[PDB]
Amino acid sequence: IQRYVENAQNSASSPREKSMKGFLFARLYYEAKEYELAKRSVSSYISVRDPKAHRFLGQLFEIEGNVEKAVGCYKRSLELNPTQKDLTLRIAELICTDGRAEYWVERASKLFPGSPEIYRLKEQLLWNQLFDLIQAELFANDVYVNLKLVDLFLSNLEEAVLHCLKPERRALR
Amino acid sequence: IYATLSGNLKQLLPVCESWEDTVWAHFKVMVDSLVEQEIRASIISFNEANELPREYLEANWTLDSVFEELQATDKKRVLEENR
Numbered sequence: 001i002q003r004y005v006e007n008a009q010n011s012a013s014s015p016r017e018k019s020m021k022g023f024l025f026a027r028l029y030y031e032a033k034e035y036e037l038a039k040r041s042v043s044s045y046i047s048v049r050d051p052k053a054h055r056f057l058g059q060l061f062e063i064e065g066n067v068e069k070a071v072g073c074y075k076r077s078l079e080l081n082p083t084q085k086d087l088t089l090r091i092a093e094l095i096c097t098d099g100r101a102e103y104w105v106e107r108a109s110k111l112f113p114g115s116p117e118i119y120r121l122k123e124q125l126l127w128n129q130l131f132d133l134i135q136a137e138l139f140a141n142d143v144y145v146n147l148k149l150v151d152l153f154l155s156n157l158e159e160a161v162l163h164c165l166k167p168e169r170r171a172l173r
Numbered sequence: 174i175y176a177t178l179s180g181n182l183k184q185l186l187p188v189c190e191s192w193e194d195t196v197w198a199h200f201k202v203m204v205d206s207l208v209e210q211e212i213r214a215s216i217i218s219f220n221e222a223n224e225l226p227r228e229y230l231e232a233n234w235t236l237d238s239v240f241e242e243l244q245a246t247d248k249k250r251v252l253e254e255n256r
Contacts, residue, residue, distance in 0.1 A: 018216040048216065 004028065019045040023053045030056070046073075049082035058090060067094045092118075098125045113137055119148070127156025134160075143167055180205025181229075192243065192254035199239050206233040 005028050011021040022045035029038025039060050042053045054077040061069040071094030074087030088108060095101030105122040109115060113136075123130070134149020146167045153160030176183040180202050190198065210231070212218050234242070244255040 015216050015219060020215055020217070049214065 001028075001031070017048045019048045019050065021045075022048060023050045026053065026056060035060070049080070051077070051084040054084055055086065058087070062090065067097050070094060092121065096121055096125065101125045113140065114142075116144070123148070127152045131156065131160065138163075143171075177201060179229075180209075192252065195243050196239070199234075199243060200236075202230070203233050203236075203239060206230060 005025065008021050008025050008028065012018055012025065015021065022041050026038045026042040026045065029035065029041060032038070039057060042056050045053050046057065054073055058070045058073040058077075061067075061073065067090070070090045074090040077084050078087045078091070088104065092101055092104035092108060095104060102122070102125045105118055105125060108118045109122065112118070130152030131149050134145050134152065137145040138149065146163050150157070150160030150164045177198065182198060182202070187195070187198070206229075209218075210233070240255075244252050246252045
């Protein structure tokens with residue numbers, strides 16, 4: 001294990017940009033036990049694509065509560081389009097901490113419409129539009145669609161109430 | 174052959190290059206430039222190996238520009254093979 005981090009340090013000193021050394025160093029640190037140094041190495045690699053770098057920093061900032069840094073990493077890791085995925089969520093959750101967020105949670109739903117916590121964060125960012133969304137979701141069994149859309153209609157709703165009654169009848173049967 | 178290996182064009186031999194043959198040579202330039210740019214971004218290439226950077230096309234064209242440039246004839250007509 002020591003040999004592998006020596007060859008990495010050599011391949012850090014010589015090819016000085018060398019992100020794959022540095023990220024590799026971070027991986028070695030993860031294998032090792034000093035997450036403050038591994039994170040620093042990952043940051044250095046970032047300064048110099050790598051999804052494991054982006055997620056180790058972004059997970060560290062996420063649990064430090066620093067959702068602005070985690071959006072920064074994950075926004076750059078998305079918009080460099082060089083090979084990653086999850087970051088989309090941490091952009092949305094940052095923006096939540098409203099109008100700007102409305103865009104990332106609507107896009108998340110267009111990628112997974114039965115994504116519940118995403119329908120929830122969407123509502124919190126935000127009546128007629130909600131009803132339409134419910135129809136789109138209900139149009140594609142699902143009680144909590146029928147319940148949220150109906151509630152939105154009530155806020156704006158007789159049809160929604162009827163739908164709720166039908167759902168109750170179904171539950172009874 | 175050396176031009177195809179380097180990811181560059183050739184000249185007299187392309188006079189007898191048909192559409193499929195010209196598509197191949199130009200896509201080969203795109204792959205050979207893209208791989209080298211990813212290798213550079215990853216820090217895989219060593220500075221010493223950069224003997225002639227100025228002589229090589231760093232830029233890559235999109236697949237769309239590949240077809241558009243191939244689609245034109247040398248004499249500014251619609252390519253009969255493309256049409």
